[PDB]
Every structure is written in structure tokens, then in C-alpha cells.
């Protein structure tokens, strides 16, 4: 596992190229918020160099670069800020779980945002990478639309105590906002599970089972992405680096408690999904029971009747077919007899 | 010494003796001609095509001073890829692969590489391999292999094997895409068998590729002085390539698994459909056959004379009960 950190060579690729491992390439933008106790300034731009002199800023600053399909801007920012090339690859790489790394001059945290669309019942994941330096917080996103609006409002309108603190409190605020978004996503999953379970009992079709299976896969991915988040917060408040002050640790502990709660909720979800899954099978087996019950009712009533009809329909030229009351109608009576009793017998089992 | 495999059709020996000044290549079917080449200070590449000929591989084994245990390992075809470090020679077991998009089968041919001072020994099973680019590079002096020792030759052979693995991955990706398209819409009985075969192939590929990654990792991370330091980074790069393969296989497996999942979702619905069909068909014919038999006895007193033209009336009542049953099956979503 552990070894000298280095760039990873890839086949069919130039030795030094960094590739964006994602799908979103629509737009790119850089929003910078440089705030202090007295005054703040925010601006949205596209030219990278216009935000480069913010590296050596006494007041804390927050640089949100939305759109990392532009590998040039990411490479320029990482090269000027002194970020390691492997960290740049991790920023551009998206098919990886949330993680935390500690370096001499910065801490690097990979986290996953989440959105859920009830239509198409889709759960989309977007990776956000945070880099905390001595006096600046870089945040690489993928596409327009984040869950850090409350933090932006707090910076703009001087709510909370975020203005009176350094960049560590800003990092805590961003992580807490992401955890709150996770809680909202869990509420949406509550709603989806309730809506699916109120239907799986009385509408047991194949598309319902496909929905249940994709929901199970969604919760599996949720567990696989939230457990590393719990580990990240644990290492963040139990192995604090010099960059993070001694103060603000209890806030990270609070975020850790929140992710413990989230993990517990996901654990309950993992069993509720199976609870829904069993119900469809039970209902289909019940319908199968009903149809095969009427089938066996018909078979039981009619097979002996056909048998005895064949017995009295076979010719031997010596057959007692002439009896009291000419013999024949009694057979029909017997038919009805060996019919009605069967029905009565089935009334013992309450079939049909 | 027993050959566990099944390929024994042909056997031949190939020799590539290359240096900076010049190279000599010869294909010989006799064991003796290749013995003296251990003494040559130039890099040497021997290739034993057939191991079913236990005599030649045994003679090479006791002539090169390699323990009979690695001989048994070479003849053990059903062996995982692995690496063994010894004082005068390093032993490596790898698996090639061949995929044909007509039978959807994945056959593995084990290959053994023994690296001794300034020479490399290959042990294969069949005519034809994936080290042709290395042969062309040696012959036409395209690369820097001619200016290095046998360790770079081993690196080149392993790299060629990894490239063949990449080609196999491309073929499997095409198969996975086609099968996914055929399964998500328009399923049939052939598709599930194809999915099972693909899952078996992916399981085998994964089960082979992880030991290969372990082999490369242990090979570059800490190695005896058999391979020079100059070739240490190159092996490292190959390891990275293997990682790609491994990860891809994992991803592929997931996709295939998902497919099987959906096919296992609708089995009970299929049961319900089948006996809906069977119950409908048996419902409307068992009583009809019963009453046909009722009118089919041989009783003399049977009221069978005229009575509104005789037979047709019963047909009528048949249809009556029939349509009644049809009505009873028009509702309840059976039909």
C-alpha cells in the first residue's frame, strides 16, 4: 500500500498528461470570495491568472473553480500553489471514494456531493475536492450547482462567526454544508422508499422490482461513499495537522457525530430494502397460489369424472349397464355425488 | 514430471542471440544446439515451444542448474501466475489468453520465464504467441533492447503480455456492450447463457490478473541484483498498466452482475404467466371432455334419439359454459 508517492503511468497516453475522468464539460467558471473581519470582496471570472495573486493573502479566501474538464486551469493552479502532481490527478480523477491526505503545506480532501431526481429515479454523484492551504481554500467542482449556498450567505451578510475566523472554519463550514446535503438526500430516500413500498404490495410488476433493485444499488453506493466520509472526519478531528488550529476541533467532532447518524440511517435502509424486496415475492407467490388453486380445483373435480365416464364408455359386450331404474341415470347421480363431496371437502380448506 | 495440459501437437526450439554488434536467430528442433548459450556473455533468448516433451525441458533443467521443483511448476499448467526469487535465477509463471467472438471461450496458455545471468528461457505450450513485437524490435533494432541486458528483455516480454491483455480487454468490452444491448431490450434464452459465460470469463480473467499484479509489484519493489537498477523504473511502469487492467475487470464484473440481477427479478412473474396460460387452457377443456365422455358411454336407455336434432344442442351448451369461462378469464387480468 504505502510507498513513495508518484505519478501513475497509463497505457495509450503521453507520460505526463493528466486526464479529466468525468462526463460534465458544459461550462467553466471561477468564483473568488476574499473576506475578513472588516470588508469582503467577491468576483466571478474566467481568466485563471486574475486569481493567482490571491495565494499570498493575509485574509482568508475561498476559490471555487467550477469545471475541471479544463485541465489547463487545474494544472496552472496546482503548479503555482505548489500542489503535488498526484494530488492534481486525484482532483481530476472522479472514480474514487472520498479520502483525506495531509501534506506539509496543505490538506487534500476528496468528497462526493449527491443529487436525486425522482423522475427516472436517478441518483447522480458529483465529486468536490478541497485543498486547505495556509491562508486559502481551493474547491474544485464539476458543474454549476453546489450545496454551499448557506456558507456563501453567511460570508456575504456576516452571519455566524465565519468572518472572525481563519480558513479552517471555512473548511469546516463547507464540510458541514455537505453533510447537511447528505441529510436532505437521506430524507429524499425516505420519501422514495415510502412511495415504493406503498405500491409494491398491490402493484407487483417487473418495473417495480427493477426500481427496488436500482434502489438497493443506490443504497449500496451510498454506504460505500459514506463510510470513507466517516473515516475522513475521524482522521480530521483525531489526527489534526498543524494547518488546522487546535481550536475548531469540536466542530469537526460535531460533523463526525452527524456522519455517524448518517451511517446508522444507511444501515437501517440496507435492511428496509430487503423488507420491501420480500413483499413482492410474497405477493406473486400468493397470486400463483390462487391461480393454481383454481386449476387444482378443476382437476380434482373433473379427472375422476372423466375416468369413470371412460370406464362406462368402454365396450366389452358383457357389461351391467341395465340395472334398477334402467341403470344409466344413477351413474350421473354418482357423478354429482363424487362431485359435490369434493366441493364440500374443499370447503374444509377454504379454497375458492 | 507430468504435463498436466492438453497441447502436445508440436514442439520446436527458437534462439535469439543479440548484442550491440550483431544478432543471430535460428529455429532448431534438436535439444543440443542450445546448451552452450549459457556461456555467452551477450543477452540470449531461448524459446521452448513444447513442454509435453518432458525430456528436453528436463535436460535444460539439470543443465542450467535449476531445481526440479521449478520444473514441476513449469509442467504444472493449472498454476496461478507467480514469482520465485533464487540466488542465480528468477522464475516467473504467467498466463496468456485467446478470445474468439464466435464461441465466447477464454483459453489460457501458461508461459514460464526463467531469467539467468545474461539469458532468458521461455517455456510455452502452443505454436503462436504475443511476443512478436519484441521479436521485431530485436531484429530491426527499432528500440533500445539491443543496448541492454536480459533484464530489459524480460521487461519487454512482460510488457508485450500486458499489451495482449489490453487487446483481450477491448474484445471483452465489445462483447459486454453487445450483450448489455441485447439484454436490456429483447431478452431471450440465449442471452442469459451468454451472460453466464461472460461472467465466467470475467471471473477467470480477474482471478488471473490479480496474481499478475502481485508478481509485478513484488518484482519491482524489492528485487535481488539479478536485474540492474536501470530497468527498475520500466518494470514499475508495467505495474501501473496492470492496475488499469485490474480496475477495468472489476468494473466489467459489476456490469455483468447487474445484468444477471434483472433476469432474476422476473422469474416468479414468468411462473405466474405460465400457469395463467395453463389454468385457462385446462379450465375450458376438462369439463368439455367430461361431458363428451358423458355422452360417450354405451348405455342402451340413453336419451339419444332426436330431441332437437340430437347433437348440436350440447355443442351450444358447451359454447355457453365455454364463453362463461372466457368471461371468467376476461376479467381478473388473466387474459
Amino acid at each position, epitope marked *: 500500500h504505502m510507498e513513495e508517492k508518484r505519478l501513475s503511468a*497509463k*497505457k*495509450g*497516453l*503521453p*507520460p*505526463g*498528461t493528466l*486526464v*479529466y*475522468t*468525468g*462526463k460534465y*464539460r*458544459e*461550462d467553466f467558471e471561477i468564483e473568488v470570495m476574499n473576506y475578513s473581519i472588516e470588508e469582503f470582496r467577491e468576483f466571478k471570472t474566467t*481568466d485563471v*491568472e486574475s486569481v493567482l495573486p490571491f495565494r499570498d493573502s493575509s485574509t482568508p479566501t475561498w476559490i471555487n473553480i467550477t469545471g475541471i*474538464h479544463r*485541465t*489547463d486551469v487545474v*494544472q*496552472r493552479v496546482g503548479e503555482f500553489f505548489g500542489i503535488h502532481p498526484l494530488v492534481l490527478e486525484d482532483i481530476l480523477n472522479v*472514480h474514487q471514494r472520498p479520502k483525506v491526505e495531509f501534506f506539509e503545506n496543505y490538506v487534500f480532501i476528496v468528497l462526493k456531493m449527491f443529487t436525486y431526481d425522482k423522475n427516472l429515479h436517478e441518483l447522480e454523484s458529483e465529486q468536490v475536492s478541497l485543498i486547505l492551504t495556509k491562508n486559502c481554500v481551493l474547491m474544485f467542482q464539476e458543474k454549476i450547482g453546489d450545496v454551499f449556498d448557506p456558507v456563501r450567505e453567511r460570508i456575504r451578510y456576516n452571519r455566524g462567526i465565519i468572518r472572525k475566523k481563519r480558513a479552517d472554519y471555512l473548511l469546516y463550514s463547507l464540510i458541514d454544508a455537505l453533510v447537511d446535503d447528505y441529510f436532505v438526500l437521506l430524507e429524499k430516500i425516505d420519501d422514495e422508499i415510502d412511495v415504493l413500498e406503498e405500491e409494491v404490495l398491490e402493484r407487483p410488476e417487473k418495473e417495480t422490482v427493477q426500481r427496488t433493485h436500482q434502489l438497493k444499488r443506490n443504497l449500496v453506493e451510498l454506504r460505500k461513499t459514506i463510510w470513507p466520509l466517516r473515516e475522513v472526519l475521524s482522521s480530521l478531528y483525531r489526527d489534526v495537522p498543524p494547518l488546522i488550529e487546535k481550536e475548531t476541533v469540536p466542530y469537526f467532532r460535531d460533523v463526525y457525530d452527524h456522519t455517524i447518524q448518517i451511517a446508522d440511517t444507511v444501515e437501517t435502509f440496507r435492511d428496509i430494502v430487503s423488507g420491501l424486496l420480500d413483499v413482492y415475492l410474497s405477493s406473486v407467490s400468493n397470486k400463483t397460489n390462487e391461480v393454481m388453486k383454481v386449476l387444482t380445483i378443476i382437476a380434482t373435480i373433473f379427472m375422476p369424472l372423466t375416468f369413470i365416464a371412460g370406464i362406462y364408455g368402454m365396450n366389452f359386450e358383457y357389461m351391467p349397464e341395465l340395472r334398477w331404474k334402467w341403470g344409466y341415470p344413477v351413474v350421473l347421480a354418482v357423478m354429482g355425488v363424487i362431485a359435490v363431496i369434493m366441493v364440500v371437502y374443499f370447503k374444509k380448506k377454504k379454497w375458492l | 514430471l507430468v504435463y498436466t495440459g492438453k497441447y502436445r501437437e508440436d514442439f520446436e526450439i527458437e534462439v535469439m542471440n543479440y548484442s550491440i554488434e550483431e544478432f543471430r536467430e535460428f529455429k532448431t528442433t534438436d535439444v543440443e544446439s542450445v546448451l552452450p548459450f549459457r556461456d555467452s556473455s551477450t543477452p540470449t533468448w531461448i524459446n521452448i515451444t513444447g513442454i509435453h516433451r518432458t525430456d528436453v525441458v528436463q535436460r535444460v533443467g539439470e543443465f542450467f542448474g535449476i531445481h526440479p521443483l521449478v520444473l514441476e511448476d513449469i509442467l504444472n499448467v493449472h498454476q496461478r501466475p507467480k514469482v520465485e526469487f533464487f540466488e542465480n535465477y528468477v522464475f516467473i509463471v504467467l498466463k496468456m489468453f485467446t478470445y474468439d467472438k464466435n464461441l465466447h471461450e477464454l483459453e489460457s496458455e501458461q508461459v514460464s520465464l526463467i531469467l539467468t545471468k545474461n539469458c532468458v528461457l521461455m517455456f510455452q505450450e502452443k505454436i503462436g504467441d504475443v511476443f512478436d513485437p519484441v521479436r521485431e524490435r530485436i531484429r530491426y533494432n527499432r528500440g533500445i533492447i539491443r543496448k541492454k541486458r536480459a533484464d530489459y528483455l524480460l521487461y519487454s516480454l512482460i510488457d508485450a503480455l500486458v499489451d495482449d491483455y*489490453f*487487446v483481450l*480487454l*477491448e*474484445k471483452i*468490452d*465489445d462483447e459486454i*456492450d*453487445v450483450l448489455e*444491448e441485447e439484454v436490456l431490450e429483447r431478452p431471450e434464452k440465449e442471452t442469459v447463457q451468454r451472460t453466464h459465460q461472460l461472467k465466467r470469463n470475467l471471473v477467470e480473467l480477474r482471478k488471473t490478473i490479480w496474481p499478475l499484479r502481485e508478481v509485478l509489484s513484488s518484482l519491482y519493489r524489492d528485487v535481488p541484483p539479478l536485474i540492474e537498477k536501470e530497468t527498475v523504473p520500466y518494470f514499475r511502469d508495467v505495474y501501473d498498466h496492470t492496475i*488499469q*487492467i485490474a*480496475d*477495468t475487470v472489476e*468494473t466489467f464484473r459489476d456490469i455483468v452482475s447487474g445484468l444477471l440481477d434483472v433476469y432474476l427479478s422476473s422469474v416468479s412473474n414468468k411462473t405466474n404467466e405460465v400457469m395463467k396460460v395453463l389454468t385457462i387452457i385446462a379450465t375450458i377443456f376438462m369439463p368439455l371432455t367430461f361431458i363428451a365422455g358423458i355422452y360417450g358411454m354405451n348405455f342402451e336407455y340413453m336419451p339419444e334419439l332426436r330431441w332437437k336434432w340430437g347433437y348440436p344442442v350440447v355443442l351450444a351448451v358447451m359454447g355457453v359454459i365455454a364463453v362463461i369461462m372466457v368471461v371468467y378469464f376476461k376479467k381478473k387480468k388473466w387474459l
Partner: antibody
Amino acid sequence: ISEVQLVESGGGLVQPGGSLRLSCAASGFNVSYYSIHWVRQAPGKGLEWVASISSSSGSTSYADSVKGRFTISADTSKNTAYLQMNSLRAEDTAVYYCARSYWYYIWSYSYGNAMDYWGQGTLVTVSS
Amino acid sequence: DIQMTQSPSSLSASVGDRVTITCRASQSVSSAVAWYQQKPGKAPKLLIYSASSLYSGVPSRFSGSRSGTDFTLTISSLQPEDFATYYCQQSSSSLITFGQGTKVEIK
């Protein structure tokens, strides 16, 4: 600052067996962070990729039709790409385009490059 | 080399119709196929990459599909500004090759 723009120059009439250097000036981006391709299109025929350069490492790729003859290079100091064409045949008369490509990811083992922005293209005529 | 055989070559259709152009790779390419359009006398313009993804800025009417080694570009509804030559490109290997083109003309 400024939009992406690729400008070709250096094309012109040249005798068979001669040599000329096509220069592709890039404005709006750094050539070191992307790959630059040269694509050939004969008069009244389809496109034909002729060369590719990765300035961050100097790795080159050539088509089989021009292997050993064309030489592609790039300099970051001038932020420019160059295609030197010698031993030039009469079949090479065509319009040349200088395009910029970016890599995208499909699977962990497979990558692909797509040409975002193309240049105007310069016409090179080999005759007489 | 990898040969991309692209058919048809002289497709003709009217405005508002549905157009499908197919192209087949000689050997396996792992979905690394792009689709470009070129009007006469101008540089090609990228439309589709990864054989399914839609490039930024192009109209949504263009669509791309892949089945094994068969790549199809579909225009759901033609426009007066959609009559140009269309080219496949495979980028699986470092030697990247184009198709022969498919001209789309009014009928």
C-alpha cells in the same frame, strides 16, 4: 483572455522533392497542456490525419503514409507547432488543418482524444 | 491500422426527416469514436465524442449510438443548416483514422 484560435501559415507552392515548414500559432491556450494534431485533406477527398504532437512530453505520432518523412515539433516559448515536410511527393498537395485535442475517459484501460478547435487550414500545392 | 468504413456515401434527405449514418470499425475500438461535420471550404466542426456524448454548443437533435463495432449518428429532424459532410474518427490507438465521409444533400 481571448478565445481559442489556431492559425496556420507557411503553405504554398513547392517543387516535388522539396521541403517546407508549416507553422501553427495558438492563441488563447498554452500548447503544453494539450495535444496538437495535423490533419490533411486532399482536393475533393476526405480528411486524413497526418501527425500528432504532445508538447508536455515531446511524444510524437505519425501516419504510415508519412512515417520517416514528416517531422512534427512544438515550442512553448513561442507557443507554436511546426510540421516540417521534406521528400515531398505530388500526392501531398492538400489543405492542412492544425487542431487541438483533449483526452476523455471511457474505461480504466481505454482513452480517446477529440479535436475541439481547428484552424483555417493552409493549401500546399506540389506540381510543376 | 484500423479501417472505418462509413456508409452511405451520398445520402439525400429532405428538411425535417430522420437521417442515420453508420460506420463500422475494421477491428475493436472501445467506444473511442467521434463524429464531425464539415461544410464545403471550412474546417470540420466536432459534434459527437465517445460515440454517445454530445459536445457543448451543438444542437440536441444530433444523437450517437454504438453497437459492438457499429457506430450510428442520427439527426432526428434535419435543418437547412445541417447539409454537410460527416466524418467518423477512431481514437483507440495513437494512429487515429477518419472515415471516407457522407455527404448530406437536399432531395
